[PDB]
Write a protein that holds these residues in place. Sequence first.
Motif, PDB file in Angstrom:
ATOM      1  N   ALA A  65       0.820  -1.202   0.000  1.00  0.00           N
ATOM      2  CA  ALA A  65       0.000   0.000   0.000  1.00  0.00           C
ATOM      3  C   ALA A  65       0.861   1.262   0.000  1.00  0.00           C
ATOM      4  CB  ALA A  65      -0.968   0.003   1.195  1.00  0.00           C
ATOM      5  N   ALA A  66       1.798   1.370   0.944  1.00  0.00           N
ATOM      6  CA  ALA A  66       2.680   2.539   1.015  1.00  0.00           C
ATOM      7  C   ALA A  66       3.498   2.753  -0.257  1.00  0.00           C
ATOM      8  CB  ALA A  66       3.599   2.400   2.185  1.00  0.00           C
ATOM      9  N   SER A  67       4.090   1.676  -0.742  1.00  0.00           N
ATOM     10  CA  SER A  67       4.936   1.760  -1.909  1.00  0.00           C
ATOM     11  C   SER A  67       4.202   2.250  -3.143  1.00  0.00           C
ATOM     12  CB  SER A  67       5.540   0.399  -2.192  1.00  0.00           C
ATOM     13  OG  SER A  67       6.941   0.522  -2.360  1.00  0.00           O
ATOM     14  N   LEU A  68       2.942   1.855  -3.281  1.00  0.00           N
ATOM     15  CA  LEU A  68       2.298   1.897  -4.586  1.00  0.00           C
ATOM     16  C   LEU A  68       1.255   2.976  -4.712  1.00  0.00           C
ATOM     17  CD1 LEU A  68       2.042  -1.763  -5.602  1.00  0.00           C
ATOM     18  CD2 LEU A  68       3.474   0.026  -6.566  1.00  0.00           C
ATOM     19  N   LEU A  69       0.517   3.181  -3.625  1.00  0.00           N
ATOM     20  CA  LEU A  69      -0.504   4.209  -3.603  1.00  0.00           C
ATOM     21  C   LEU A  69       0.135   5.587  -3.617  1.00  0.00           C
ATOM     22  CD1 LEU A  69      -3.749   3.656  -1.658  1.00  0.00           C
ATOM     23  CD2 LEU A  69      -3.235   3.930  -4.073  1.00  0.00           C
ATOM     24  N   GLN A  70       0.618   5.984  -4.795  1.00  0.00           N
ATOM     25  CA  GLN A  70       1.206   7.303  -5.008  1.00  0.00           C
ATOM     26  C   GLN A  70       0.674   8.022  -6.256  1.00  0.00           C
ATOM     27  OE1 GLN A  70       5.206   8.098  -3.884  1.00  0.00           O
ATOM     28  NE2 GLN A  70       5.601   5.892  -3.689  1.00  0.00           N
ATOM     29  N   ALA A  71       0.692   9.358  -6.248  1.00  0.00           N
ATOM     30  CA  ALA A  71       0.110  10.144  -7.349  1.00  0.00           C
ATOM     31  C   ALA A  71       1.021   9.985  -8.567  1.00  0.00           C
ATOM     32  CB  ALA A  71       0.011  11.608  -6.956  1.00  0.00           C
ATOM     33  N   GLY A  72       0.433   9.675  -9.720  1.00  0.00           N
ATOM     34  CA  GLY A  72       1.233   9.288 -10.867  1.00  0.00           C
ATOM     35  C   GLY A  72       1.198   7.810 -11.195  1.00  0.00           C
ATOM     36  N   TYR A  73       1.189   6.969 -10.166  1.00  0.00           N
ATOM     37  CA  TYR A  73       1.136   5.515 -10.346  1.00  0.00           C
ATOM     38  C   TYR A  73      -0.182   5.128 -10.971  1.00  0.00           C
ATOM     39  CZ  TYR A  73       5.255   5.344  -7.420  1.00  0.00           C
ATOM     40  OH  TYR A  73       6.500   5.560  -6.896  1.00  0.00           O
ATOM     41  N   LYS A  74      -0.134   4.309 -12.020  1.00  0.00           N
ATOM     42  CA  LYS A  74      -1.365   3.943 -12.719  1.00  0.00           C
ATOM     43  C   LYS A  74      -1.861   2.618 -12.189  1.00  0.00           C
ATOM     44  CE  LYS A  74      -0.155   6.363 -16.867  1.00  0.00           C
ATOM     45  NZ  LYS A  74       0.152   6.240 -18.310  1.00  0.00           N
ATOM     46  N   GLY A  75      -3.177   2.518 -12.041  1.00  0.00           N
ATOM     47  CA  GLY A  75      -3.806   1.265 -11.708  1.00  0.00           C
ATOM     48  C   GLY A  75      -4.772   0.964 -12.845  1.00  0.00           C
ATOM     49  N   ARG A  76      -5.472  -0.160 -12.753  1.00  0.00           N
ATOM     50  CA  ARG A  76      -6.254  -0.682 -13.873  1.00  0.00           C
ATOM     51  C   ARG A  76      -7.674  -0.871 -13.367  1.00  0.00           C
ATOM     52  NH1 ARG A  76      -3.729  -5.688 -16.953  1.00  0.00           N
ATOM     53  NH2 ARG A  76      -2.908  -4.076 -18.321  1.00  0.00           N
ATOM     54  N   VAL A  77      -8.652  -0.283 -14.049  1.00  0.00           N
ATOM     55  CA  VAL A  77     -10.046  -0.563 -13.719  1.00  0.00           C
ATOM     56  C   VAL A  77     -10.687  -1.379 -14.845  1.00  0.00           C
ATOM     57  CG1 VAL A  77     -12.188   0.430 -12.827  1.00  0.00           C
ATOM     58  CG2 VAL A  77     -10.068   1.650 -12.516  1.00  0.00           C
ATOM     59  N   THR A  78     -11.505  -2.366 -14.474  1.00  0.00           N
ATOM     60  CA  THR A  78     -12.196  -3.197 -15.468  1.00  0.00           C
ATOM     61  C   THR A  78     -13.701  -3.312 -15.191  1.00  0.00           C
ATOM     62  OG1 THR A  78     -11.426  -5.105 -14.178  1.00  0.00           O
ATOM     63  CG2 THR A  78     -10.257  -4.621 -16.231  1.00  0.00           C
ATOM     64  N   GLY A  79     -14.492  -3.491 -16.247  1.00  0.00           N
ATOM     65  CA  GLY A  79     -15.920  -3.638 -16.046  1.00  0.00           C
ATOM     66  C   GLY A  79     -16.718  -3.788 -17.326  1.00  0.00           C
ATOM     67  N   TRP A  80     -18.019  -4.009 -17.149  1.00  0.00           N
ATOM     68  CA  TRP A  80     -18.955  -4.186 -18.258  1.00  0.00           C
ATOM     69  C   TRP A  80     -19.978  -3.044 -18.291  1.00  0.00           C
ATOM     70  CZ3 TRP A  80     -17.843  -8.857 -15.383  1.00  0.00           C
ATOM     71  CH2 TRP A  80     -17.282  -9.923 -16.123  1.00  0.00           C
ATOM     72  N   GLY A  81     -19.656  -1.940 -17.623  1.00  0.00           N
ATOM     73  CA  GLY A  81     -20.578  -0.826 -17.564  1.00  0.00           C
ATOM     74  C   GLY A  81     -20.563  -0.033 -18.850  1.00  0.00           C
ATOM     75  N   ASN A  82     -21.286   1.075 -18.850  1.00  0.00           N
ATOM     76  CA  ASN A  82     -21.471   1.857 -20.049  1.00  0.00           C
ATOM     77  C   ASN A  82     -20.188   2.452 -20.544  1.00  0.00           C
ATOM     78  OD1 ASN A  82     -24.207   1.373 -19.727  1.00  0.00           O
ATOM     79  ND2 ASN A  82     -24.362   3.093 -18.333  1.00  0.00           N
ATOM     80  N   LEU A  83     -20.198   2.754 -21.837  1.00  0.00           N
ATOM     81  CA  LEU A  83     -19.034   3.268 -22.546  1.00  0.00           C
ATOM     82  C   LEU A  83     -19.067   4.790 -22.624  1.00  0.00           C
ATOM     83  CD1 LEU A  83     -19.329   0.798 -25.516  1.00  0.00           C
ATOM     84  CD2 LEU A  83     -17.633   0.556 -23.643  1.00  0.00           C
ATOM     85  N   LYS A  84     -20.210   5.339 -22.247  1.00  0.00           N
ATOM     86  CA  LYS A  84     -20.505   6.744 -22.445  1.00  0.00           C
ATOM     87  C   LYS A  84     -21.432   7.084 -21.310  1.00  0.00           C
ATOM     88  CE  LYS A  84     -21.460   7.319 -27.308  1.00  0.00           C
ATOM     89  NZ  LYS A  84     -20.215   7.645 -28.059  1.00  0.00           N
ATOM     90  N   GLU A  85     -21.284   8.302 -20.805  1.00  0.00           N
ATOM     91  CA  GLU A  85     -22.153   8.813 -19.750  1.00  0.00           C
ATOM     92  C   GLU A  85     -23.633   8.899 -20.167  1.00  0.00           C
ATOM     93  OE1 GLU A  85     -20.901  12.633 -18.453  1.00  0.00           O
ATOM     94  OE2 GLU A  85     -22.697  12.991 -17.259  1.00  0.00           O
TER      95      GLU A  85
END
Lengths: 11, 26, 249
Positions: C126-146
């Motif tokens: 958590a400490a090492s990685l949760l930093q501004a700039g570090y990219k994480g990945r979100v996945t899902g089947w939700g809408n493509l457009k608001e």
Amino acid sequence: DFEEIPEEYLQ
Amino acid sequence: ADCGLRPLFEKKSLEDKTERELLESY
Amino acid sequence: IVEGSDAEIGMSPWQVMLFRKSPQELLCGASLISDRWVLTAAHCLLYPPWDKNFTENDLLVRIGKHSRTRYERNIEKISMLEKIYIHPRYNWRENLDRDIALMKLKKPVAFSDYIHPVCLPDRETAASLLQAGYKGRVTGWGNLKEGQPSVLQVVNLPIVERPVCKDSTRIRITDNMFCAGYKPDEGKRGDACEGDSGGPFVMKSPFNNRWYQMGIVSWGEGCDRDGKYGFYTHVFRLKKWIQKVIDQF
Ligand SMILES: Cc1cc(OCC2(CONC(=N)N)CC2)cc(OS(=O)(=O)c2ccccc2S(C)(=O)=O)c1
């Protein structure tokens, strides 16, 4: 839209 | 205990198409 | 997911789909953290302002999926919940603070190529990685457009500084969330959108090359609006409650 799942599950 | 190691990537030593973007940001 | 691409087969094997029995419909995403536990956003299950209050029998969890709508024969497994645990201090009245819930599967799922739990983070990951700039990945089947994808979508988003997250909204931010997303100037886009809630935000540790889940897709205003950000339940801050639940029941 959704394909029907096996009814074994919807029990 | 095997958590976070993907059968079809890390376990085979295959990278997915975008994971380098993540790691390049660390 | 707005401005993401199709997932590769096997790419997020912990990605679980929360599925309403009747009407049969995608409720939320979610994640496989063991063979018996699924982790999701509490507002997927219980959100009084919208008369949303699902119980164990309202719900099916489908694991292994890639296609949103097909029933993937011999690939996905569909299970029923035995029990649902919502954080005792989830705050739906005001800011969705502690937006987290655990669901106990009625029987353990077996792992395969397409089904594998993610890791939960320890303090120093958590400490090492949760930093501004570090990219994480979100996945899902939700809408493509608001409008909705055929196939699991993925997007990679940078963590955004705490002050920048606070000046982007009127809603009161707490230590139990963080926000991710591109600034309007960075000239890249992307965001979760309706149906993606409950989903995993994950990061690959460079130290041991495992995938850890640092965030739960929680809340945000619009989808992929400039100057707005997505907000994610901060999973480590609430692991103490997770450990408790799991090794009490
Ligand atoms: C449950 C939910 C989910 C949500 O977002 C759903 C998402 C995830 O977050 N959104 C984005 N990252 N774009 C799936 C899209 C947005 C929501 O409204 S709110 O944030 O303005 C919000 C947040 C806290 C308190 C009150 C309100 S409100 C203004 O009353 O609707 C509410």
